[PDB]
Amino acid sequence: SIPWNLERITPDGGSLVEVYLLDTSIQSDHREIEGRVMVTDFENVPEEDSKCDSHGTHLAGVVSGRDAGVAKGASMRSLRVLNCQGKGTVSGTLIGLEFIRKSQLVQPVGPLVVLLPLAGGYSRVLNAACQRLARAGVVLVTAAGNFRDDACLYSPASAPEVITVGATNAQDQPVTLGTLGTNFGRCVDLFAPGEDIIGASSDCSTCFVSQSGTSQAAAHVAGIAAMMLSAEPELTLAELRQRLIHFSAKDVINEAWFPEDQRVLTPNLVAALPP
Amino acid sequence: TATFHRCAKDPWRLPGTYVVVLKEETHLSQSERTARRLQAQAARRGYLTKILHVFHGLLPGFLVKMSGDLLELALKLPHVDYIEEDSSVFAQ
């Protein structure tokens, strides 16, 4: 018996890639991710209006966790841009993206994947900073957003240079999240498993919890990208995108879940690892 | 040609903090001079400002905590491409 999402993407890899995570604080000594995530000194969070590290700990586990991770050989570096309530700022995220590029210039390693499991409204400056970091050779993966809306109205989802990931469930259908659900439209690059994802729970050192969202879906694509770049390190961003589409399951999403005008614009692709 | 932008989702706006984005290829030294220049011009008008951060590496510019009353003046600073009011992002 394996978590459904790990079976869905399979038709210790990712060791050549470092995955940066801009999220809440992380419980770095949880058994699922201990020794796999290096916590940077970076913190830039707004004041608030076991739970502080819930979101980031689960996502670190989805990417590289011992028992339930996608790219179990990848190393991760974490930056805290979301406060205890999961809220951050565009400026804090900009400073974090600049910190990643500064860190890379000071001590270069192999291919870098940056996971942005967050969203705000369309931001010219956040899209420009993502565009610049992607043009600099870094791979960015972001959540499409959980607003049951057009991803082009949110950032970094609307940045064309970022790999924007929507969420699908075990029936390969778009995830519902309360009254809302995955975003869609022409700014989404592909979908990935984002419902009932088993992953590290920060409640205890061996606890696991299932979570749903486009952040979980984006973490799956960050893990798949880490595996793909480790196997073929010379891939450009355009080639990595070609591979993600190529190895994806095609036309399995029932496009009737999307609004009528978004059906031809939304890619009908569910991510998967190469065989 | 310098423009002002703020989040279209009004509850997510964070007024009082602005990201001043300078033209591509503006150097760190030029961004620091532009930030000092805004602080001097605002102080002559009786306004207190704070330069929270100076950007370089991806985008040239700076993060400033100031009254939005200073935006018309800030858009006339040398090297300015655009200014964006800070806004919230959320865990997905």
Curated annotation (Swiss-Prot), chain A:
Expressed in neuro-epithelioma, colon carcinoma, hepatic and pancreatic cell lines, and in Schwann cells. Changing residue 203 to Y: In FHCL3; partial loss of cleavage by furin and PCSK5; no effect on protein sulfation but inhibits phosphorylation. Disulfide bonds join 52-84, 152-187. The active site is at residues 23, 55, 215. It comes from the Eukaryota. Residues 3-275 form the Peptidase S8 domain. Cleavage by furin and PCSK5 generates a truncated inactive protein that is unable to induce LDLR degradation. Monomer. Can self-associate to form dimers and higher multimers which may have increased LDLR degrading activity. The precursor protein but not the mature protein may form multimers. Interacts with APOB, VLDLR, LRP8/APOER2 and BACE1. The full-length immature form (pro-PCSK9) interacts with SCNN1A, SCNN1B and SCNN1G. The pro-PCSK9 form (via C-terminal domain) interacts with LDLR. Interacts (via the C-terminal domain) with ANXA2 (via repeat Annexin 1); the interaction inhibits the degradation of LDLR. Belongs to the peptidase S8 family. Crucial player in the regulation of plasma cholesterol homeostasis. Binds to low-density lipid receptor family members: low density lipoprotein receptor (LDLR), very low density lipoprotein receptor (VLDLR), apolipoprotein E receptor (LRP1/APOER) and apolipoprotein receptor 2 (LRP8/APOER2), and promotes their degradation in intracellular acidic compartments. Acts via a non-proteolytic mechanism to enhance the degradation of the hepatic LDLR through a clathrin LDLRAP1/ARH-mediated pathway. The C-terminal domain (CRD) is essential for the LDLR-binding and degrading activities. The catalytic domain is responsible for mediating its self-association. It is linked to Hypercholesterolemia, familial, 3: A form of hypercholesterolemia, a disorder of lipoprotein metabolism characterized by elevated serum low-density lipoprotein (LDL) cholesterol levels, which result in excess deposition of cholesterol in tissues and leads to xanthelasma, xanthomas, accelerated atherosclerosis and increased risk of premature coronary heart disease. FHCL3 inheritance is autosomal dominant. This is Proprotein convertase subtilisin/kexin type 9. It comes from Homo sapiens (Human). The lineage of its organism: Eukaryota, Metazoa, Chordata, Craniata, Vertebrata. The gene is PCSK9.
